[PDB]
Design a protein around this nucleic acid. Structure first.
Lengths: 109, 184, 220, 104
RNA sequence: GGCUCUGUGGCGCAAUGGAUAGCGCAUUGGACUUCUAGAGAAAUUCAAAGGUUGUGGGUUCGAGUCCCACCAGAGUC
């Protein structure tokens, strides 16, 4: 489907022009039908994984656990809990970011 | 062994000294539903009896702390009847498993109807502490719409609370995922 | 006296420390809570009204002239004064009557298990009724000539209320639980038709917590 | 399949003097403004709902009391009361505070 | 035409014990949290007002608290 690649391109454009990230790369995972935008926000710093998603889709809990496991495998750093970010877009290029982690470890909003 | 009067699906505690032993020793709270004898024209502070949730009643029953009795004889909660219609439902078992799992860790618990959730998770006694989490009970195979997660995240941001997702695996262990807004 | 204390003395905290200063405020807040649940009421015998419960007929009938509450509660039949079970329970819990049963005095308990039954009023309905009654509202029963249960009048109509010709109520309520499905369009349409020209309010009870939502039609 | 429903909703709210915009940060579908010059920057938040004519319907949003409470609590700062639209019926939902309505 | 009940800050009500009139919700003023001014429901929470106790007589060491008349309004025969 062209929806995933279109949303990935929109997120890439937003991260380049607005958020000003560097060395953002697109890596494919043709087992879960997902695209990971594994980039580097600051040179010589940690990596991040972004999974764009339109508002039409729906997520279960098993899918979330599988995505965290895949992200941990890609990062290959068993020193921090599994985590990734979700990007939701619309027809007029409006993007909202939410971060999903493992465990509780989070009394903040 | 304290006494709890269960009848018509409600559990009420009438003694003023059994309520004190429940809060300090077993870490179980509750909501007062009576009217204050001194001030019975207000809706702020209420009195006895104390209303227990079904999960709290079952937790007190199993671990051997109180004895459930019928409306005037011991009552059995393992068989569906007119005084206990909670046996044999998926949602009740889901909520009971999650309640027991969170209670064993050392948290205080409460109802979260106004905040669009199932439970409120405290770091300590609801006196002198703000609640930290809004727990939601989801079956592992259910699909969560994305329009109903953004509203929960926005409410959590506006109230300074984090959203928890709970789904007990068939192995008897429960996994938790934390969601929060990230600004970048 | 007449003043009542505050639940938590000041703003709450965020994270526990265990520094012996957070364990003193907790103790002071806890010991002031069970000093309040242990209080019990007392009233002089010169201002009590006697009454008797009659499960065979299904009312509560008085044996003495009523007082100030007669302007808003009760109903008279065959020369006697009679009350509904929920009105009787509210009056007993408020302390305005001295209900007996077969020449045997009753308590607040052992009467929750005689009047609160599926045949008579339930528990949630009594909760909503007492919640509205403690604020000064006039709560009545909905006579047709989920279902509409109560008729509610504002607190400004108490002074000159007339039981025989009350008039048009402020609203009317249907009490529901919190974990039950939202009614579809047809049920809401039928409820709106049956209510009439007055607003309809939905009361949700969640293990002792009550919130109200109003469903209005024809925005434009 | 929801593209057609969005199209009829946009056209119906476009015929009148209302300019509609999409709202993704609030969990709704559209936000109806009014007038050219700004007056309140928000007038309504509409949740598009579709049902069939047999009193059962195929619902894309399984509405319950928890979801409605959360939506109403969120849609207070940026709107002037929630709006349920049926495909037309316009039912409006709002909160009734018990201690603020006992006198005029 | 009798009989029973009622009259206190803007509203609902206490003052049981002979007091000197004060609780709650509204209004006002602060402190925090949050949103793009505004909102705040165990993320919310403190402080303060104020008033012919229906109108006149007597008893009161003393009157909201006891007796009479007058005014108003809710049931009943």
């Amino acid at each position: 489907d062209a929806t995933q690649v279109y949303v990935a391109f929109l997120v890439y454009l937003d991260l380049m022009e607005s958020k000003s990230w560097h060395e953002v790369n697109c890596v494919g995972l043709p087992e879960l039908q997902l695209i990971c935008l594994v980039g580097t926000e600051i040179e010589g710093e940690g990596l991040q994984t972004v999974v764009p998603t339109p508002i039409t889709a729906s997520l279960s809990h098993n899918r979330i656990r599988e995505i965290l496991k895949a992200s941990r495998k890609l990062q290959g750093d068993p020193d921090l809990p599994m985590s990734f970010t979700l990007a939701i877009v619309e027809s007029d290029s409006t993007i909202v970011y939410y971060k999903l982690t493992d465990g509780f470890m989070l009394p903040d909003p | 062994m304290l006494v709890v009067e269960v009848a018509n699906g409600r559990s009420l505690v009438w003694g003023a000294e059994a309520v004190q032993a429940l809060r300090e020793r077993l870490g179980v709270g509750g909501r007062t539903v009576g009217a204050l004898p001194r001030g019975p024209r207000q809706n702020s502070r209420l009195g006895l009896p104390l209303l227990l949730m079904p999960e709290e009643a079952r937790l007190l029953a199993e671990i051997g702390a109180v004895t459930l009795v019928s409306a005037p004889r011991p009552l059995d909660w393992r068989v569906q009847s007119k005084d206990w219609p909670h046996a044999g439902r998926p949602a009740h078992e889901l909520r009971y498993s999650i309640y027991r799992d969170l209670w064993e860790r050392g948290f205080f618990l409460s109802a979260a109807g106004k905040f669009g959730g199932d439970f409120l998770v405290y770091p300590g006694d609801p006196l002198r502490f703000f609640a930290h989490y809004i727990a939601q009970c989801w079956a592992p195979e259910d699909t969560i719409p994305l329009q109903d997660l953004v509203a929960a995240g926005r409410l959590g941001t506006s109230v300074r609370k984090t959203l928890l997702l709970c789904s007990p695996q068939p192995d008897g262990k429960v996994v938790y995922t934390s969601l929060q807004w990230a600004s970048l | 006296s007449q003043k009542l204390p505050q639940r938590s003395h000041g703003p709450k905290d965020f994270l526990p420390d265990g520094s012996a200063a957070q364990a003193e405020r907790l103790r002071r807040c806890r010991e002031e809570l069970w000093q309040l649940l242990a209080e019990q009421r007392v009233e002089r015998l010169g201002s009590l009204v006697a009454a008797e419960w009659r499960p065979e007929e299904g009312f509560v009938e008085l044996k003495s002239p009523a007082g100030k509450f007669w302007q808003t509660m009760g109903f008279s039949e065959q020369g006697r004064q009679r009350l509904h079970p929920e009105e009787a329970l509210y009056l007993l819990e408020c302390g305005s009557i001295h209900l007996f049963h077969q020449d045997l005095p009753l308590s607040i308990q052992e009467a929750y298990q005689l009047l609160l039954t599926d045949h008579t009023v339930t528990f949630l309905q009594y909760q909503v009724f007492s919640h509205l009654k403690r604020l000064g509202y006039v709560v009545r029963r909905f006579q047709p000539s989920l279902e509409i249960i109560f008729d509610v009048y504002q607190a400004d109509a108490v002074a000159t209320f007339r039981k025989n010709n009350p008039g048009k109520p402020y609203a009317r309520m249907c009490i529901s639980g919190f974990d039950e499905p939202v009614p579809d369009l047809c049920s809401l349409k039928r409820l709106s038709y049956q209510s009439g020209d007055v607003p309809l309010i939905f009361a949700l009870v969640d293990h002792g917590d009550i919130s109200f939502y109003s469903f209005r039609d024809f925005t434009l | 399949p929801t593209f057609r429903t969005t199209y009829m909703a946009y056209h119906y709210f476009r015929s009148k003097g209302w300019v509609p915009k999409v709202g993704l940060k609030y969990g709704t579908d559209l936000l109806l403004y009014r007038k050219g010059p700004p007056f309140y920057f928000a007038s309504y938040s509409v949740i598009i709902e579709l049902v069939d004519d047999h009193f059962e319907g195929s619902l894309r949003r399984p509405l319950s009391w928890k979801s409605l409470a959360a939506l109403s609590r969120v849609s207070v700062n940026v709107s002037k009361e929630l709006m349920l639209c049926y495909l037309v019926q316009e039912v409006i939902l709002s909160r009734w505070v018990s201690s603020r309505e006992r006198s005029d």
